[PDB]
Amino acid sequence: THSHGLFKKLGIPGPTPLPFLGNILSYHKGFCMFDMECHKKYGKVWGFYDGQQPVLAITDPDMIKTVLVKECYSVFTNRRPFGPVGFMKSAISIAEDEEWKRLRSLLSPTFTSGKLKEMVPIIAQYGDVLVRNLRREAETGKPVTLKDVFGAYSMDVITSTSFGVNIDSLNNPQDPFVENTKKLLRFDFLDPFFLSITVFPFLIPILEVLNICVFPREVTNFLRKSVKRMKESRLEDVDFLQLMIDSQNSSHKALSDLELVAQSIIFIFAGYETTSSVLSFIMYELATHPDVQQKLQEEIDAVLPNKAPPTYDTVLQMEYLDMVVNETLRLFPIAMRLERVCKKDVEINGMFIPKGVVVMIPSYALHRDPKYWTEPEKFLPERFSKKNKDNIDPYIYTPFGSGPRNCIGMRFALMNMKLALIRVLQNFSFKPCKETQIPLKLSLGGLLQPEKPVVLKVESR
Amino acid sequence: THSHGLFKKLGIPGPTPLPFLGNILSYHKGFCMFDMECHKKYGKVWGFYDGQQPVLAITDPDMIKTVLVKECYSVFTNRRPFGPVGFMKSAISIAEDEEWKRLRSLLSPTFTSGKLKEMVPIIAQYGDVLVRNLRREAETGKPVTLKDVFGAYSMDVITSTSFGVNIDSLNNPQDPFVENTKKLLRFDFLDPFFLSITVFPFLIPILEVLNICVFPREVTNFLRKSVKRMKESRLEDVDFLQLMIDSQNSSHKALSDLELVAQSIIFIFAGYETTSSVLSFIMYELATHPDVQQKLQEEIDAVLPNKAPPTYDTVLQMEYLDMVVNETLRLFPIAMRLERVCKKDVEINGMFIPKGVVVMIPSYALHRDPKYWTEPEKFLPERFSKKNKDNIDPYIYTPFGSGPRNCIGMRFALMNMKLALIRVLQNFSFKPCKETQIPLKLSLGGLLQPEKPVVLKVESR
Numbered sequence: 001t002h003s004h005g006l007f008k009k010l011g012i013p014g015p016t017p018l019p020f021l022g023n024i025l026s027y028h029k030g031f032c033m034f035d036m037e038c039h040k041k042y043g044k045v046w047g048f049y050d051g052q053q054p055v056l057a058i059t060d061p062d063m064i065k066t067v068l069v070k071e072c073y074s075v076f077t078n079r080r081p082f083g084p085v086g087f088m089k090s091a092i093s094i095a096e097d098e099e100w101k102r103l104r105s106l107l108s109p110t111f112t113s114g115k116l117k118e119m120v121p122i123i124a125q126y127g128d129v130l131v132r133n134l135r136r137e138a139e140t141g142k143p144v145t146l147k148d149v150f151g152a153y154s155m156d157v158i159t160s161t162s163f164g165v166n167i168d169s170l171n172n173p174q175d176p177f178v179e180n181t182k183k184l185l186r187f188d189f190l191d192p193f194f195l196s197i198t199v200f201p202f203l204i205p206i207l208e209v210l211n212i213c214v215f216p217r218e219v220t221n222f223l224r225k226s227v228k229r230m231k232e233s234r235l236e237d238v239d240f241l242q243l244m245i246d247s248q249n250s251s252h253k254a255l256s257d258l259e260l261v262a263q264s265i266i267f268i269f270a271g272y273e274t275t276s277s278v279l280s281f282i283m284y285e286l287a288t289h290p291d292v293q294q295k296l297q298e299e300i301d302a303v304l305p306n307k308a309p310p311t312y313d314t315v316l317q318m319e320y321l322d323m324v325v326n327e328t329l330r331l332f333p334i335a336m337r338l339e340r341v342c343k344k345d346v347e348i349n350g351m352f353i354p355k356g357v358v359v360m361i362p363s364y365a366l367h368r369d370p371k372y373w374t375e376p377e378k379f380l381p382e383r384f385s386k387k388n389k390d391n392i393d394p395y396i397y398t399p400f401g402s403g404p405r406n407c408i409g410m411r412f413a414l415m416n417m418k419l420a421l422i423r424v425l426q427n428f429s430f431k432p433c434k435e436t437q438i439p440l441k442l443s444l445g446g447l448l449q450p451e452k453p454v455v456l457k458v459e460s461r
Numbered sequence: 462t463h464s465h466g467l468f469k470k471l472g473i474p475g476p477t478p479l480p481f482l483g484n485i486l487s488y489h490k491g492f493c494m495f496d497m498e499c500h501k502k503y504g505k506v507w508g509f510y511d512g513q514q515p516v517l518a519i520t521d522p523d524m525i526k527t528v529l530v531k532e533c534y535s536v537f538t539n540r541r542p543f544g545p546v547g548f549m550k551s552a553i554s555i556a557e558d559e560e561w562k563r564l565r566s567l568l569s570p571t572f573t574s575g576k577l578k579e580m581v582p583i584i585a586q587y588g589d590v591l592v593r594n595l596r597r598e599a600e601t602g603k604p605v606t607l608k609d610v611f612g613a614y615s616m617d618v619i620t621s622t623s624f625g626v627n628i629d630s631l632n633n634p635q636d637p638f639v640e641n642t643k644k645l646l647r648f649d650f651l652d653p654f655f656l657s658i659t660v661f662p663f664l665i666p667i668l669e670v671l672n673i674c675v676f677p678r679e680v681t682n683f684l685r686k687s688v689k690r691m692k693e694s695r696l697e698d699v700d701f702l703q704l705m706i707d708s709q710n711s712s713h714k715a716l717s718d719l720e721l722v723a724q725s726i727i728f729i730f731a732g733y734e735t736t737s738s739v740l741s742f743i744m745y746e747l748a749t750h751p752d753v754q755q756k757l758q759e760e761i762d763a764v765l766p767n768k769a770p771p772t773y774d775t776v777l778q779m780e781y782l783d784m785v786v787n788e789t790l791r792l793f794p795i796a797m798r799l800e801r802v803c804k805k806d807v808e809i810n811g812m813f814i815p816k817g818v819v820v821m822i823p824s825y826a827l828h829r830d831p832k833y834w835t836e837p838e839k840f841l842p843e844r845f846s847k848k849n850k851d852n853i854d855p856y857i858y859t860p861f862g863s864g865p866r867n868c869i870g871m872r873f874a875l876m877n878m879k880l881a882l883i884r885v886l887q888n889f890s891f892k893p894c895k896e897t898q899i900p901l902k903l904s905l906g907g908l909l910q911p912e913k914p915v916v917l918k919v920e921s922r
C-alpha cells in the first residue's frame with residue numbers, strides 16, 4: 001500500500017484495495033462489469049488501484065473532452081504503459097510524446113479518404129471470394145461459424161491492403177503468409193501473464209533484458225524480412241506498405257525501415273481480430289432481429305439493383321447500414337476502456353489530478369447507461385437515424401476514441417466492414433440455429449468476445 | 462550488447478565494450494584515471510558504456526556551455542539516475558525536470574549572500590572550538606589526523622547552520638544528534654553494490670518495492686521526526702531549517718514537510734564530508750609547501766592583527782587565501798565528473814546526440830590537462846592571482862559545476878572553509894611527519910580521497 005492512500009486523501013470514492021494486489025480481485029467478472037458497478041456505487045468520478053497504480057475513472061462529458069482533446073498534447077498524451085514490447089516501441093499505438101507525434105504525422109496521409117477510395121476495388125474483390133465460400137457452406141445446409149468465414153475475409157483484406165499479397169486464406173489454410181498472421185491474437189489483459197505484470201510492474205525491465213516480447217519473436221522476424229524483401233523486390237517494378245515507402249521519400253525525419261515493420265504489424269493486429277469480431281456481433285444482431293435484417297436487405301437492393309457491385313460512393317450513401325454498424329458498436333465496443341497517463345500536476349474541470357495517475361474512461365459502461373440511452377441493452381438501430389442522432393453526446397459514444405489520438409483507421413475499418421455486409425446480404429439470409437446462444441453472453445475475460453462462438457443458419461436468396 | 466553499437470555507428474571513438482559489462486572493468490583504476498587515458502587515446506569527444514548505458518564524454522569548452530547553460534532546461538536538465546532513493550526523490554540534487562525547478566526556486570533565497578552574512582558569527586564560534594581541540598593535540602606533541610579534527614568542526618558547523626543544535630562533537634562523541642549524522646557517508650559508485658546497479662539497472666525497481674534505500678532507513682527516520690519536533694518546539698518561540706520553514710509561509714507550491722526533511726539531509730550530506738575532505742587536501746598542500754603556508758599566514762596577520770576574529774568582509778578581502786583554496790580544488794575536485802541526461806534528439810556544436818545518452822564532462826581530467834595548465838600536477842597557487850586568473854577558461858575549471866544546476870552552496874562552502882583556515886593558521890603551523898604520505902596517493906575507488914589518512918605535525922605559534 002505504497003500509493004494506496006492517494007484517493008482517500010483527495011476525497012475521491014472507491015473500493016478498498018488489498019495490499020499489493022489492490023483491486024485486481026474484482027476483475028473476476030471482467031472489465032465491463034467492474035466498470036458498470038463502480039459507475040453505480042460512486043457516481044461521476046471514482047478511483048481504484050491496478051496493483052500499486054492508481055486509476056481515476058471519469059464519466060463527465062465536459063471532463064472527457066479536456067483529457068482526449070484539449071489537454072492532450074500538454075497533459076494526457078500517452079497510454080497506459082505495458083510490456084515487454086521490444087522493437088514494437090516504435091509502433092504508433094505504443095510510442096509516447098514526441099516520437100508518437102512524429103509517427104502520427106508520417107502515417108496520417110496513409111489514412112485519408114483519397115487513399116481509401118483507391119483501396120475499394122481491391123477490398124471488393126474479396127467480398128466476392130467471401131460469397132463463394134459462404135455459398136458452399138449454405139448448400140452444406142448446416143450452421144456456419146461466423147468468425148471462421150469472416151476471419152478468412154478479414155485476413156484476405158489485410159494481406160492485400162497492407163502488403164499486396166492476394167490469397168484465398170480459407171482455401172489456402174497452410175500458406176506461409178497466412179500461417180504467421182494467424183499467430184497474432186488480441187492481448188487478454190485479465191489473463192495470467194498480463195495480470196502478473198500489473199501486480200509486478202518491476203518485472204517488465206527484467207523481461208526486456210531477456211529479449212522476451214509480448215509479440216512472438218518469430219511472427220515479428222518473419223515480417224521484418226518479408227518487408228525488406230518486398231522493399232527490394234517491388235523495388236524496382238496501393239497497399240499500406242507502398243504508402244509508407246513513399247512517405248520515406250519526402251516530423252521531421254523519414255520513416256526508418258524498422259519503424260516501417262512496426263506499423264505494418266500494428267495494422268495487421270488492428271484490422272484482423274477487430275473486423276472479424278465486429279462482423280460477428282452484427283450478424284448475431286441481424287439474425288436475432290429479422291425486422292432489421294430485412295429492412296437493410298431492401299436498402300441494399302435500392303442503391304445496388306441486380307446485386308450491383310458496391311462502390312465507395314454507394315457505401316457512404318447507405319444510412320441504415322451505417323445505423324446498424326453504429327448500434328452494434330454501441331453494445332460491443334471492442335476497446336471497452338479509453339485510458340491516458342497524466343504527465344503533470346494538473347487541474348481539469350475543477351478537480352486536482354496528480355502526476356502518474358492513469359485517467360480512464362469506461363466506454364462500455366457509458367454505452368449502456370440509461371442516463372443517455374433509452375432501453376440501453378436493447379438492439380434498437382433507430383437511435384442513430386438522422387432524426388435521433390442529435391441526442392447523442394459525442395463524448396459518451398466513443399467507439400473509435402476521440403481527440404488527436406483517436407483511431408487512425410476508423411474509416412478504413414468502417415469501409416472494410418460495410419463492403420462485407422453488403423455483399424453478404426445481397427446473397428444470403430441469416431437465421432438462428434438451436435445451438436445459437438440467445439441471449440449472447442460476453443466472455444468473463446479481458447476481451448469483448450462471445451463466451452461461445454456464434455453459429456447461425458445461412459440460406460441462399 | 463543491446464545498445465553497444467551506437468557509438469560505432471556515429472563514428473565516435475571509444476574502447477571496446479564487453480557484453481553486458483560494457484567498459485566497467487576499466488574502473489579498476491578509478492574514475493579519474495580511466496578519464497585521463499580516454500582523453501589521451503581519443504581526443505576531444507569519445508564514448509563508452511556503463512553496462513548498457515552509453516556515456517558520451519565531451520571536452521570542448523564551447524560544447525560544455527551548451528550542455529550546462531544554454532540547452533539546460535530544454536535538453537540536459539537531469540542527472541544520471543540512480544537508486545533506490547525512496548523519499549529522497551524530493552531532494553533537489555535528485556529531483557528531475559519540473560519538480561527540480563520548483564525546488565531550486567524555493568531554496569535559492571536560502572543561499573543568498575545576505576543570509577550567509579548572518580550565519581558568519583555562528584560559524585566563527587566553532588573556529589574557536591577548533592583551536593582549543595587542536596591546541597590540546599599540539600601539546601600532545603604527536604601527529605594529528607586531519608579528517609578527525611576537521612570532521613568534528615564540519616559536523617559542528619552543519620548541526621548549527623541547518624538545525625540550530627550546538628554541540629562539541631569531538632568532546633561529545635556519543636551525542637544522539639552526532640551519532641546519526643556520522644552514519645552518512647559518501648556514496649562509492651565503484652563499490653560492489655553501486656557497480657551491480659550499473660550492470661543491473663533493472664534491479665532498481667525491485668529494491669524500491671522492498672523499501673530498501675541507499676540512505677539508511679534509520680538516519681532518515683531520526684531526522685524525519687527531529688524536524689517535526691523542532692517544527693513544533695521552535696514553534697512557537699538563522700538556521701537552514703528556519704529559512705525553509707519561512708519559505709512555506711509565502712514554484713508555485715509551498716515546501717512540504719517531507720520535502721523539508723529531504724533538503725536538510727542533502728545539506729548534511731553535502732557540507733559534512735566535502736568540507737572536511739577539502740580542508741584535508743589544503744593542509745597537506747600547505748605542509749608540503751611551507752613557502753605557501755608562510756605567505757598565507759602573513760596575509761592573515763595583515764587583515765587580522767592581534768589574531769583578530771575574521772568577519773564576512775575580512776574573509777572576502779583575502780585573495781591569497783582564495784588562491785590557495787582554488788588551487789587545491791583544481792588538483793582535488795571532489796566531483797571528478799559532471800553529468801547530464803539527454804532528454805531529446807538534439808544536435809549541439811555540430812554533433813548529433815541521441816535521446817537517452819548520458820553526457821559527461823571529465824572535470825578531474827580537464828583540471829590536469831597541459832593544454833590549459835602549465836605544470837598541471839604541481840601545486841602552484843599563482844595560477845589564480847589576479848594577474849594570471851584571466852587565462853582560465855570557466856568551462857575547464859568547474860569545481861562547483863556551471864549553469865542553472867551548479868552547486869547551490871558553493872559560497873556557504875567557501876565561507877565555511879576559509880573561516881576554518883584563518884583561525885587554524887592564526888594559531889598553528891603544520892609540518893610533515895615521517896608517516897606523512899609524500900606524494901599523496903589518491904584512492905583507487907570511486908571517491909577523491911587519500912589512500913592513507915593525512916597525518917601532519919602541529920606546533921603552536
Ligand code: HEM
Pocket residue numbers: 068092093094104266267270271274275278334335338339398399400401402404405406407408409410412413414
Ligand atoms: C471496428 C474496428 C476498430 C475500432 C472500433 C477501433 C477503435 C479504436 C480505439 C477505441 C482506439 C483508441 C482511441 C483512444 O485511445 O482514444 C483505437 C486506436 C488506434 N487504431 Fe483502431 N479501431 C478499429 C480498427 C482499426 C484498424 C483497421 C486500424 C488500421 C490501421 C486501426 C488503427 C489504430 C491505431 C494506429 C490506433 C492508435 C492511434 C494512436 O495511438 O495514435 N484501428 N482504435
Ligand code: HEM
Pocket residue numbers: 529553554555565727728731732735736739795796799800859860861862863865866867868869870871873874875
Ligand atoms: C567544497 C565544497 C563543495 C563543492 C566543491 C561542491 C561541488 C558541487 C558540484 C560539482 C555540484 C554539481 C554541479 C553540476 O552538476 O553542474 C554540486 C551540486 C550541489 N551542491 Fe555542492 N559542493 C560543495 C559543497 C556543498 C554544500 C556545503 C552544499 C550545501 C547545501 C551543497 C549543495 C549542493 C546542491 C543542493 C547541489 C545540487 C544542485 C542542483 O541539483 O540543483 N554543496 N556541488
Ligand SMILES: O=C(CCc1cccnc1)N[C@H](CS[C@H](Cc1ccccc1)C(=O)NCCc1cccnc1)Cc1ccccc1
Pocket residue numbers: 050079080081082093185186187189198266269270273274335407
Ligand atoms: O494500453 C493498453 C492497456 C494495458 C493494461 C490494461 C489493464 C491493466 N494493465 C495494463 N491497451 C492497448 C495497447 S495494445 C493494443 C491491443 C489490441 C487490441 C485490439 C486488437 C488487437 C490488439 C493494440 O495492439 N492496438 C493496435 C491497434 C488497434 C487495435 C484495435 C483497434 N484499433 C486499433 C491500447 C489500445 C486500445 C485500443 C486500440 C489501440 C490501442
Ligand SMILES: O=C(CCc1cccnc1)N[C@H](CS[C@H](Cc1ccccc1)C(=O)NCCc1cccnc1)Cc1ccccc1
Pocket residue numbers: 511540541542543554646647648650659727730731734735796868
Ligand atoms: O548522479 C550521480 C552519478 C551516479 C552513477 C555514477 C557512476 C555509475 N552509475 C551511476 N552522482 C551524484 C548524485 S548523489 C551525491 C553523492 C555525494 C557526493 C559527495 C558527498 C556526498 C554525497 C549527493 O548526494 N549530493 C548531495 C549534495 C552535494 C554533495 C557534494 C557536493 N556538493 C553537493 C551527483 C552529484 C555530484 C556532486 C554534487 C551533487 C550531486
